[model samples]
Target: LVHVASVEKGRSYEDFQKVYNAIALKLREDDEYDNYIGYGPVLVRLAWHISGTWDKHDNTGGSYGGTYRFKKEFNDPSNAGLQNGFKFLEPIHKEFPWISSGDLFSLGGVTAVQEMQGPKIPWRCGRVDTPEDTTPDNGRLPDADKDAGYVRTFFQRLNMNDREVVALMGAHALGKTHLKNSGYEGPGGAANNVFTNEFYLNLLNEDWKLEKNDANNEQWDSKSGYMMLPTDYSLIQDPKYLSIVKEYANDQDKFFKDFSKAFEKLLENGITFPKDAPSPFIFKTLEEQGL
Candidate 1:
């Protein structure tokens, strides 16, 4: 049941950096997507959904396999909105056919975050794509209707604690939920395309009301026109989660540091990195590279 890290043959940091540039360039060129929100949020969600499938009890579904490209996992109801991300990466993959699917997908996440002015997520290469039969059954993703208790327990299967859970949800600041995608709708904050700790700030500051959307789903809505899924709102409802939410809202740097660690951990789950494996790569953003 052990999945070892197998770096794409002869691939190095410079090669992946090229792929990152491609993704970042496409992100900048395609400015009209989702009402100009671009592809950042959905790319991050695609990475998370692909990795979140991992089960600590047994190393079955995880980012290592890249099985999300398969029909069973790709068609999972929870993945409804992610086709846009896959379509976005298709060209990049064609350009760098040497990279494995797992690597491409996870790298897309890291690139989106950094290019969006989010934290630098140190990422490792070596997730060899497994067979389609290894794809996990659907329904492993967390439900948007759950409360704090359920949110806590749901993450336990993926081995994510409260802090990691809270930090990851900070990504909500980047994208909006479409009713057609997940029965949820609305941007999480004003800076939806640019990554920020606004998800935490809005959760603590906004006066939220429980309202049903056109899909007849209950979501926490604010006067500012932002929305929070039941799980996102749970971070403030529970006492422990509330404290962390407040901390993130107050300290942007702290949130960035914690989020980078948690995100890297999430993407690397279920893979055994050999002691001799190369250290994770902290890619330079397009801005840093002056590209």
Candidate 2:
């Protein structure tokens, strides 16, 4: 007894693109939330946190539920400042009431990455909203204080291999550690709002010192004023993770290609799709679509 659900057929690429336009415009408008950096990074993190709850074996949690829309999930302690991102999306959600919550959350991540100069992720639509009780516990997201062994083991539960783990961490390039939010501080790169392999480059080339920021949490910092969370620095300390780090740090094209594939897999975890389902769609960016 397995039952399959069909996509709400009325929505299409054009519809989602309009949604993307709203998100992109908002990102442009809200460019001063964190030290004048904008909300793009946190929005991407919001999308990841929502999807990251997936446990591949049981299929009990994932982006399919869009449960983050509920109070309990929204109020999770680890999700402290993400309300800013939700509020950022409120208007777009109003404009396109037909789009599913799950789709909108994931699409927000997709648009943020592409608009910020990252690779294009192919996305599919079928996620539906479920009851608030369906929300997974708050601990499902990765811990920023964890080590490499913990990071490696954590992602395995999500069905990601070593390479995927590294690519996802590449997202650190886009967002900073908020002292109040994650108890860590400082931008991970010079252009944190824009996507680049600057995370990997900084990790490899910077002269880093271990110091606690105003939050009193330890992070690796350099003279340029950029910082990396201890968990992010753990990538280089572990040989296996370092290899992929070097691979991405050296080749931009390869990094973009791998990141695109790994990120799509991360966002699409848990949900079941039929064999006849259409391939994931690669939507044009607002600039590309001339929106």
Candidate 3:
């Protein structure tokens, strides 16, 4: 199930930048979503969900296929709240029909993170769409109700180490889980749309209690109107993960740097770029362009 990279013909940095600009402009224009939290967070989550399907073991599922556009992957229970992000990208995809679904999905994440003042995520484009049969089964994604050991073991399937796992989980600082979508609710902090070390900071500082939601699922709730899934809380409960969490909470720059690398790796999983493939593209943020 190896996936090969095939860059779009005649496309280069400028072309991808155009896509980035379009996503950024829409992020600014669509301000009323989720109480003004904007589409940035969910877009990031959408990117992660799409890429997270990769399995280092067999390379069965990954962003390379873009099978999420198919009914099977789209309807996965784990993808419940992502329709908004998908719909948001529909017009952009329509405009740039040449871009592969895998590339667009992953790039949307890079765009969202940078536009929201997060670190620069280097991206490469070369994912060709595959048939729906390539879509992985629904249960490949990790469960929110799992424990520390489960969290650590699950990511191994994706070939992520502790540091990479911790850094990637930092994305939880952005989007929130929806009760209707994931049976969990609430943002991780006050700045749900801003990318920061807030998830780790809150996880370390908040006084959380284990309680069942209206859906009768147990989660850690805080007085600050935040919540943590069993998997998230596992960070603190595990010494190795807790060490990295504390470091990220203590140093913002370190988190940003590590997050950038880990995110790029996450998006690039399961694809082999050719020796002559172009270097990863680093797009300028909207702020840099003064848009």
Error of 1 at 257 (Å): 0.4
Q: Please, what is the TM-score per model?
A: 0.99, 0.95, 0.98
lDDT of each: 0.93, 0.85, 0.92
Model 2 TM-score?
0.95
Off by over 4 Å in 2: 1-5
Q: Which whole-number lDDT from 0 to 100 does residue 261 have in model 3?
A: 96
In candidate 1, list every pair of residues with a backbone clash. Answer: none
TM-score ranking, best first? 1, 3, 2
Tell me the number of clashing residue pairs for each predicted model.
0, 0, 0
lDDT of 2 by residue, 196-227 (tens): 88889999999999998887778888999898
Candidate 3 structure quality by residue, lDDT tens digits, 1-291: 678899999999999999999999999999999888989999998899998988897888889999999998999999988999999999999999999999999999999999899999999999999997888889888899988899989999888999999999999998788889989988888888888899999999999999999888999999988999999999999999999999999999999999999999999999999999999999998889988
- Weakest lDDT window of 10 consecutive positions for candidate 1: 179-188
Could you report the Cα RMSD, in angstroms, for every candidate shown?
0.7, 1.6, 0.8
Candidate with top TM-score is 1
How high is the lDDT of residue 56 in model 1?
96
